[PDB]
């Protein structure tokens, strides 16, 4: 019964795949297109009403045999159109009566090294489920955008609207999924009923194409993503239905690793939404990309995290109304995906902004002490690899900050930070201007990262300790001089003695 | 075997470098111990007096008998590091000792 149980969990999809095969067996006439509609109906109900889908599971596959029967009976060429429906019904039969009920039971949530491997594999499986439970609205939303950014129309436009007004406001996520599934299927059906013989000679999406699978493959994979997401949700639900803290950071290396896999976008999030806006104005360089520039330099200027958290409501609305308007002006368009990657990142920082309201020792020294010095080398190589006028500015800022650097690493935060913030504004101005007047932005983006990382080191609590050390050395300098001078005088005397001994002997 | 033979020579070099930086090392340790206490007072929010140092180059190491905790355990970690890490420490020590000859 091992294989019977394998079939009672991982083989119902063979029937579903076969549905498609029948529908796409050569020239699709009405009946083959209705075959597709039936496949679609099954998968659509799975999402909409899981309970009801389960209720009409094998009943629908029995209706499947029903359809296939009539076809083959009425309709070598003709025999190949009988063969495939026969194959389809055969697969159904096996699940239908022999594995359908134990499957309704699998879905009922209401040697030596082989054992070692099994345990290792078990750990992996559990972990990967957790990750894909939370990081899946991302891939769904991204794929439905890549599809509707390539096939610009007025029937795939609604899909952009759905996954671009449900990413900022994340209460709509369930209804987004629902309406996408139905609509993607409307698209699939219409485009198929356009590959008919009475449908002959685009803005509205529907067009003709000789490879029928290749044509309706894109929108089919979207239906797939959507449904796969629901499977993962319920599978993980079943697992637990049946069957990395702050402290850890300051213990071992693995402790810290865990803290960051858990929370990275929790902490370093304002920084990553700003490094995504720099990407838009570096891959597009048009005129509608200059307003992304002005938002960066009006959000960055309010230097307090709390003040920025009051403008995020508008940053997120703007980025969503700009993707739609730029795609209305692309219908009457594959670089507008950078305006998406950023409506995603920023909708996620709006979440942190309302949820915060609710040998390792060796590494910490080389990040909180000898990093200011590496930022300063990058400033030089940002401005001496790209020979221009802006590049000279970087060279000359390195020179200033190397000379008056020791004093900066010691001053109270107020100032420490003023200087850094100023250096950040030269970067942003350069980035926003190289655009208005058009060698590129890559090296000014490595730099914008480093300088935003050091603003965080200079505002930590672990830097307070390095400030202490540096302050102390300035006080104990006098002692140092004395120690050195004493040592010098001692050696002088020893040498002088030796010379006098020689002169006595002589 | 050659890898292990090479490791023996690495240790020989490390020994030489440690002798080349000996005087600097001693001066540093006197000042590190002094800094340990100095920072404590600063962190308290109090003044750094002469008494702080009184609680505690080669001569001053011997005279001082206030054995500090953290600094000693740190030295053990250093001794118990891999040969690679220790060889690189030796190189940094040499550069930071004779910096003039580098500039030149």
UniProtKB/Swiss-Prot annotation, chain B:
Q: Which residues carry this modification: Phosphoserine?
A: 58
Q: Where in the cell is it found?
A: Endoplasmic reticulum membrane; Endoplasmic reticulum-Golgi intermediate compartment membrane; Cell membrane; Cell projection, Lamellipodium membrane
* Organism superkingdom: Eukaryota
**Transmembrane feature ranges:** 69-104
Q: What does UniProt note about where in the body, tissue by tissue, this protein is expressed?
A: Expressed in numerous tissues. In normal brain, expressed exclusively in neurons, not in astrocytes. In Alzheimer disease brains, expressed in about half of the activated astrocytes located around classical senile plaques. In Parkinson disease substantia nigra, not detected in melanin-containing neurons nor in activated astrocytes. Expressed in erythrocytes (at protein level). Expressed in myoblasts (at protein level).
Miscellaneous field: Piezo comes from the Greek 'piesi' meaning pressure.
Disorder cited: Dehydrated hereditary stomatocytosis 1 with or without pseudohyperkalemia and/or perinatal edema: An autosomal dominant hemolytic anemia characterized by primary erythrocyte dehydration. DHS erythrocytes exhibit decreased total cation and potassium content that are not accompanied by a proportional net gain of sodium and water. DHS patients typically exhibit mild to moderate compensated hemolytic anemia, with an increased erythrocyte mean corpuscular hemoglobin concentration and a decreased osmotic fragility, both of which reflect cellular dehydration.
What the protein does comes down to:
Pore-forming subunit of the mechanosensitive non-specific cation Piezo channel required for rapidly adapting mechanically activated (MA) currents and has a key role in sensing touch and tactile pain. Piezo channels are homotrimeric three-blade propeller-shaped structures that utilize a cap-motion and plug-and-latch mechanism to gate their ion-conducting pathways. Generates currents characterized by a linear current-voltage relationship that are sensitive to ruthenium red and gadolinium. Conductance to monovalent alkali ions is highest for K(+), intermediate for Na(+) and lowest for Li(+).
Family as reported in the entry's similarity comment: Belongs to the PIEZO (TC 1.A.75) family.
This protein's assembly is summarised as: Homotrimer; the homotrimer forms a propeller-shaped Piezo channel with a cation-ion conducting pore. Heterotrimeric interaction may occur between PIEZO1 and PIEZO2. Interacts with PKD2. Interacts with STOML3. Interacts with TMC1, TMC2, PCDH15 and CIB2; the interaction may be part of the MET complex. Interacts with MDFIC (via C-terminus); the interaction prolongs Piezo channel inactivation. Interacts with MDFI (via C-terminus); the interaction prolongs Piezo channel inactivation.
Q: What is this protein called?
A: Piezo-type mechanosensitive ion channel component 1
Identify the species of origin. Homo sapiens (Human)
Q: Which residues of the full protein are shown?
A: 1513 to 1692 of 2521
């Amino acid at each position: 019964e091992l294989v019977k149980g394998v079939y009672a969990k991982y083989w119902i999809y063979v029937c579903a795949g076969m549905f498609i095969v029948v529908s796409f067996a050569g020239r699709l006439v009405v009946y083959k297109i209705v075959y597709m509609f039936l496949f679609l109906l099954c998968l659509t109900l799975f999402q909409v009403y899981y309970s009801l889908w389960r209720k009409l599971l094998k009943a629908f596959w029995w209706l499947v045999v029903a359809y296939t029967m009539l076809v083959l009976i009425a309709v070598s060429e003709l025999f190949s159109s009988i063969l495939v429906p026969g194959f389809f019904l055969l697969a159904c039969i096996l699940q239908l009566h022999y594995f359908h009920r134990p499957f309704m039971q699998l879905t009922d949530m209401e040697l030596e090294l082989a054992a070692g491997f099994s345990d290792v594999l078990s750990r992996v499986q559990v972990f990967l489920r957790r990750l894909l439970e939370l990081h899946v609205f991302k891939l769904v939303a991204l794929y439905t955008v890549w599809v509707a950014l390539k096939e610009v129309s007025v029937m795939n436009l609604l899909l952009v609207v759905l996954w671009a007004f449900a990413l900022p406001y994340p209460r709509f996520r369930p209804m987004a999924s629902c309406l996408s599934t139905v609509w993607t299927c409307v698209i699939i059906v219409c485009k198929m009923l356009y590959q008919l013989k009475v449908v002959n000679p685009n803005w509205f999406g529907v067009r003709k194409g000789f490879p029928n699978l290749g044509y309706i493959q894109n929108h089919l994979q979207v239906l797939l993503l959507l449904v796969f997401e629901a499977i993962v949700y319920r599978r993980q639900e079943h697992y637990r239905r049946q069957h990395g803290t702050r402290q850890q950071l300051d213990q071992d290396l693995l402790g810290c690793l865990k803290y960051f896999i858990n929370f990275f976008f929790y902490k370093f999030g304002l920084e990553i939404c700003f490094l995504m806006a720099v990407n838009v104005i570096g891959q597009r360089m048009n005129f509608l990309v200059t307003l992304h520039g002005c938002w960066l330099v009006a959000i960055l200027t309010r230097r307090h995290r709390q003040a920025i958290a009051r403008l995020w409501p508008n940053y997120c609305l703007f980025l969503a109304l700009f993707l739609l308007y730029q795609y209305l002006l692309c219908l009457g368009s594959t670089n507008l995906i950078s305006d998406f990657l950023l409506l995603l990142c920023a909708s996620q920082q709006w979440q942190v902004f309302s949820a915060e309201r609710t040998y390792l020792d060796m590494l910490k020294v080389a990040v909180f002490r000898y990093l200011f010095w590496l930022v300063l080398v990058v400033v030089f190589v940002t401005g001496a690899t790209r020979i221009s006028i802006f590049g000279l500015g970087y060279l000359l800022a390195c020179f200033y900050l190397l000379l008056f650097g020791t004093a900066l690493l010691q001053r109270d935060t107020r100032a420490r930070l003023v200087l850094w913030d100023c250096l950040i504004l030269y970067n942003v101005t350069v980035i926003i201007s190289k655009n208005m007047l058009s060698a590129g932005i890559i090296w000014d983006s490595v730099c914008f990262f480093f300088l935003l990382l050091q603003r965080r080191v200079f505002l930590s609590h672990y830097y307070l300790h390095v400030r202490a050390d540096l302050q102390a050395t300035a006080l104990l300098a006098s002692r140092g001089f004395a120690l050195y001078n004493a040592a010098n005088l001692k050696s002088i005397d020893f040498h002088r003695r030796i010379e006098e001994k020689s002169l006595a002997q002589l | 075997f050659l890898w292990m033979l090479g490791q023996a020579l690495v240790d020989e070099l490390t020994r030489w470098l440690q002798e080349f930086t000996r005087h600097h090392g001693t001066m540093s340790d006197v000042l590190r111990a002094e800094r340990y206490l100095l920072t404590q007072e600063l962190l308290q929010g109090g003044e750094v007096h002469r008494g702080v140092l009184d609680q505690l180059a080669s001569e001053l190491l011997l005279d001082r008998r206030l054995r500090i905790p953290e600094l000693e355990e740190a030295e053990l970690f250093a001794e118990g590091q891999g040969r690679a890490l220790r060889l690189l420490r030796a190189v940094y020590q040499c550069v930071a000792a004779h910096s003039e000859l580098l500039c030149y």
